[PDB]
Design a protein around this ligand. Structure first.
Ligand code: RET
Ligand code: OLA
Ligand code: OLA
Ligand code: OLA
Ligand code: OLA
Ligand code: OLA
Ligand code: OLA
Ligand code: OLA
Ligand code: CL
Ligand code: CL
Length: 264
């Protein structure tokens, strides 16, 4: 049901996709160790924001790892090209994983925005419901990326509605609570918003690849887009969230944070 199944791949195409996913694994697990060791310099009220980056690194790292082994499982070099065998490859498992990873990305944002208690719970709940609506309708949509492009588009429109509403909640909370933020991170958080808008928008672009580039090179392009998007939305994003957590920790008088920033 996925366009990947439609084509044979050159050694070049096949190896490049393998390398993309493997590099993705390496980058996420490398970052994981960074978030782990810096977590001790985060104040208790923000430390979970850095823990969530660890959780995202392993979750995303495992899905990329799974995609890579699925890739090599599904294809074998036969008569001069990589051809589909008995096992299958699908991006559908990415969508399932988003059900967990996207709430984590959203939660660590709310935490460094200094949301607490009832507002935290209510905002998270609405955000997670919006995200799940987006992911599920998008998941259903890509089931038709071969059989019914029209249906892919309509489900994608519904998904984009959830996407836009979710982004509006994110933007609203960021620009409203920006003033509460310490150590100059009121400026930093604005770049985080635009990073999210940029990086997250790469995913619906990848979703539409079967509509504007239905060939083996389009398959490569989609994986390339996922790689840019994953690294930007999880790794670069996590580094900024953690930077914001440490800076605010130091500004609130957390001594390990102050000492850590002093060494650099
Ligand atoms: C780490 C993974 C992330 C941040 C994934 C984010 C995914 C999206 C923003 C997906 C958006 C979609 C649309 C807005 C329309 C097409 C269907 C989706 C689910 C791909
Ligand atoms: C930076 C270099 C990126 C690696 C290019 C891989 C494409 C190829 O070798 O076919
Ligand atoms: C934050 C951005 C992260 C970027 C990650 C991607 C790094 C490698 C990107 C690709 C370089 C272009 C490779 C050439 C493609 C050759 C075409 C092919 O052989 O199929
Ligand atoms: C392989 C990676 C090993 C990572 C172990 C690092 C332990 C961190 C110690 C700590 O800060 O609590
Ligand atoms: C095939 C029917 C798909 C139903 C989509 C349900 C939308 C989910 C909304 C938020 C949870
Ligand atoms: C909750 C929203 C659920 C779906 C809204 C209906 C619009 C998209 C469904 C397309 C159905 C189809 O194309 O057969
Ligand atoms: C051409 C690859 C980069 C595309 C970035 C633009 C999409 C996000 C816009 C906000
Ligand atoms: C080419 C440009 C690629 C960008 C690479 C991004 C790398 C990591 C981002 C680190 C986040 C630090 C937040 C900003 C620090 C500060 O505000 O002074
Ligand atoms: Cl604290
Ligand atoms: Cl993920």
């Amino acid at each position: 049901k996925n366009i990947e199944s439609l084509f044979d791949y050159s050694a070049g195409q096949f190896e490049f996709i393998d390398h993309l996913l493997t590099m993705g694994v390496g980058v996420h697990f490398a970052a994981l160790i960074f978030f782990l060791v810096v977590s001790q310099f985060v104040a208790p009220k923000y430390r979970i924001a850095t823990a969530l980056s660890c959780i995202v690194m392993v979750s995303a790292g495992l899905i990329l790892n799974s995609q890579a082994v699925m890739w090599t499982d599904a294809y074998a070099y036969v008569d001069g090209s990589y051809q589909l065998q008995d096992l299958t490859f699908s991006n559908g498992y990415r969508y399932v994983n988003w059900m967990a990873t996207i709430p984590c990305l959203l939660l660590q944002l709310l935490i460094v925005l200094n949301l607490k208690g009832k507002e935290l719970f209510s905002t998270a709940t609405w955000l997670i419901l919006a995200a799940w609506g987006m992911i599920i309708t998008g998941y259903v949509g890509q089931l038709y990326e071969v059989d019914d492009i029209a249906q892919l588009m309509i489900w994608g429109a519904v998904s984009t509605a959830f996407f836009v509403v979710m982004n509006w909640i994110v933007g609203t909370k960021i620009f409203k609570n920006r003033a509460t933020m310490l150590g100059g991170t009121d400026s930093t958080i604005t770049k985080v918003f635009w990073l999210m808008m940029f990086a997250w928008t790469l995913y619906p672009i990848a979703y539409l690849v079967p509509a504007f580039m239905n060939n083996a090179d389009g398959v490569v392009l989609r994986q390339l887009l996922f790689t840019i998007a994953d690294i930007s939305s999880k790794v670069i994003y996590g580094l900024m969230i953690t930077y914001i957590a440490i800076q605010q920790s130091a500004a609130a008088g957390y001594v390990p944070a102050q000492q850590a920033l002093g060494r650099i």
